[PDB]
Symmetry: none
Subunit: 244 residues, 2 copies
Amino acid sequence: HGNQLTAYTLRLGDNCLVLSQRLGEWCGHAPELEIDLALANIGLDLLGQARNFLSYAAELAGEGDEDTLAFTRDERQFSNLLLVEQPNGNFADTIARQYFIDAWHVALFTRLMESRDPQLAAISAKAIKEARYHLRFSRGWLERLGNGTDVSGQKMQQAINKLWRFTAELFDADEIDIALSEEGIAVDPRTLRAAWEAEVFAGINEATLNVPQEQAYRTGGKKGLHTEHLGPMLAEMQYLQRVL
Amino acid sequence: HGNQLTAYTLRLGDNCLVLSQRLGEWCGHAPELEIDLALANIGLDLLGQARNFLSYAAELAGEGDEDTLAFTRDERQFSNLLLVEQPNGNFADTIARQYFIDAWHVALFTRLMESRDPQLAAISAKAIKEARYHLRFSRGWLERLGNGTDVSGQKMQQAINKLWRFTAELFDADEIDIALSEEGIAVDPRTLRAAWEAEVFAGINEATLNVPQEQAYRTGGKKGLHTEHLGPMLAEMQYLQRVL
């Protein structure tokens, strides 16, 4: 059971760490200073939550710390969702990725605040506040791009379409999710789908765009099975740790 | 001659290119937003200078362009001074590195703008203006950190000390320097020491700091012999070219 809790805690931290790294790559390349500052702020919030989760996972494991966990594991040991390791692409692609994960975070942390694990509950109490601001930002830009010129609307629709194949993974429950949720410790991913859709489907329509059709999807992140993008990203992250 | 002019032009381009990438790594990590934007600006100036030099070198070589030069060369093919490939360290370490190269650029371009080579003269004529701003910035921060906190003057002195071993290389002349300077095209590095010392020594003492004592130094950059730091840097550039 200790291993299950460690793995659960670590994957939540991995999601934050990986996304944080992607947002960091935007620094100095955003369309405006305002956007550049917002993305850096979200990345910093995510890095902080990554520290909290990894720190707790190292404690549970009885060895290492947030740094050993963040910088000494190769992709096979990373357990983040595939959605956060995807390339930044254009601003629209980054906005779609952010909105999907932000809506997920708000739903997750809202429920995880009730966790019988006091540390997970405490972390969620702080993360929920950050997630709400992220969502306000990502949903706001989704709306603005979708309601802008048809060209920006097309770019926003395309971003939504290409990243939709990574949304289903957010709602599948594995053995760890099931065991820990029956214990009132973890949130059953399956139970977050309704809240996510209510937010996302509404946001997409209010941006005057279409919700993609459900199709076969990509998965494996929580089991250490990733896309070709994570490896290179981790090498970069580890390098930046050495030089900066 | 053709090969020497190409090598000379490329080396100046490499200095700028390598340093711009290091400054780019400071994005979002500077002490304050103002400093962050300033470093990002210097880096962009340097990247602009790098394009001019590399573009010219590619022309001289009658093959390739700035992109193939910047991205298809391994470390043994790079010709930047060792000082610019050094890690950022803390803000003081970055200020020492910047101040030393800015003083050098001002001394060099002030004279190279009178090169028999019209393209080098033109590039230098534009570069010197930018270089003056860089120097004001770096010297300004040197004076500011040196005369600041006890810990600041301490970190600044340590920054000066650890990078001093990379300053002598800026003044050694090789076969290319000598041949091209005799043709009135290049500036003989040995003749830049006087101006450089007049600037840097004054700045260091004005900052209430001590000029390190000369001793054995590191060199080889100009002929493709680099420290352990360049290889990883190039790998990072390659990565960044792929991701965004």
